[PDB]
């Protein structure tokens, strides 16, 4: 409705209606969905991904890293006024904004192996803070990185600091990334700070013809 394709996949709190959708025939998106990246930022190869959706008819959402499994990091403190759910300021439902526990931020080394039979859409992100101060306030370690690996992926992301105009009240930025993890293959993350980790990911349950229509209209009870 008022959600965007990004909003839906990342699971903006305002898009909860779409947390777990049944097979579809086409997707319909408004010209300017009100509920998109509540926390300002950017979605990498966003168009190339949308193109991938034009060939998919069904996701089944699965958990690949439980929120509860983050022992040596705060997972529940990862929330923002830029993403209100209902008063209580919130965050993207499908990814965790991990933050320092005690005074510290241990190197994360987590990996998921795709024991499923179908291709898997995996999402994650990086936080770009305002200054060294905020960097150090939230994560501890001042010089950070996120490394991600697949049989095909060789990514090392590095947070980028800069003073920027506020958007939805945040001068910070969030930058999300994605990959398709083939069956029997694994994805290995490693990070030391500014990591926005996966919780939920999407199985490509069936592939076929579809499209992303741009229409302001709503469902008509017809065929």
């Amino acid at each position, epitope marked *: 409705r008022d959600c965007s394709v990004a909003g839906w996949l990342l699971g903006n709190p305002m898009c909860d209606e779409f947390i777990n959708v049944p097979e579809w025939s086409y997707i319909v998106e408004k010209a300017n969905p009100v509920n998109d990246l509540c926390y300002p930022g950017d979605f990498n190869d966003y168009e190339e991904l949308k193109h991938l959706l034009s060939r998919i008819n069904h996701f*089944e959402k699965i958990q690949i890293i439980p929120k509860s499994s983050w022992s040596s990091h705060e997972a529940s403190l990862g929330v923002s006024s830029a993403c209100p759910y209902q008063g209580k300021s919130s965050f993207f439902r499908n990814v965790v904004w991990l933050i320092k526990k005690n005074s510290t931020y241990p190197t994360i080394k987590r990996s998921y192996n795709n024991t499923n039979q179908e291709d898997l859409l995996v999402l994650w992100g990086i936080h770009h803070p305002n200054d060294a101060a905020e960097q150090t306030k939230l994560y501890q370690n001042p010089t950070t990185y996120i490394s991600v690996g697949t049989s095909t992926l060789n990514q090392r992301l590095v947070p980028r600091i800069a003073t920027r105009s506020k958007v939805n009240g945040q001068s910070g930025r969030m930058e999300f990334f994605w990959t398709i993890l083939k069956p029997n293959d694994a994805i290995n993350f490693e990070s030391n700070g500014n990591f926005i980790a996966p919780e939920y990911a999407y199985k490509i349950v069936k592939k076929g013809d579809s499209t992303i229509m741009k229409s302001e209209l709503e*469902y008509g009870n017809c065929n």
Partner: antibody
Amino acid sequence: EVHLQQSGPELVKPGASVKMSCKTSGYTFTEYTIHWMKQSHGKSLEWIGGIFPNNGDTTYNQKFKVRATLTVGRSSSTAYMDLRSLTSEDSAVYYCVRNYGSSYGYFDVWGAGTTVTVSS
Amino acid sequence: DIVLTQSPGSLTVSLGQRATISCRASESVDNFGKSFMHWYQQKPGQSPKLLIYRASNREFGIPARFNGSGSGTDFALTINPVEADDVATYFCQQSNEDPRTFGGGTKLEIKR
């Protein structure tokens, strides 16, 4: 969540009328047709009707055309059914159910069940 | 009316085995290339539950033990392996053509 909260169990004198309600919550009322199902105590499911909130179009079963009346309160996010001039026949359970898409759709979210008892 | 007739009426199957419930439609329920059949599960003492839509695909949060199969005039819900919490009456219902019609229903019992 997709919860459907419906009316509490009811008793009606034979010949009278009932109006059980079903309150929608958790999704957009106006995107899906709501329907009613009757189940003769531990036997078989019968389809009564359907109504699409957004404009109030109704679709009835032959059997219930007369005795039944689906209505919708858009501000209330609520669907109502009304059974007029009852008999022992109508003593059974009534489910307020959300059907997914149109004429060719599956009922995915079923409500609790308002159970009606017709006796003097 | 598309009369839906399920068979058998009652089925008792040993634990850890295969339950095989059938559905038969008076006329086809099968155009646009897809079957418009649905399976529903009513665990005792509560409202029915959605298992399979358009005869073959599982609704989210349904274990793989449920095999939706069939095309045209006859279908089959296959539960295998049968678990403990599978005592229920199972219903098939067609959406191909109003008025929406359901099956008689099949009650499943566990041999222990």
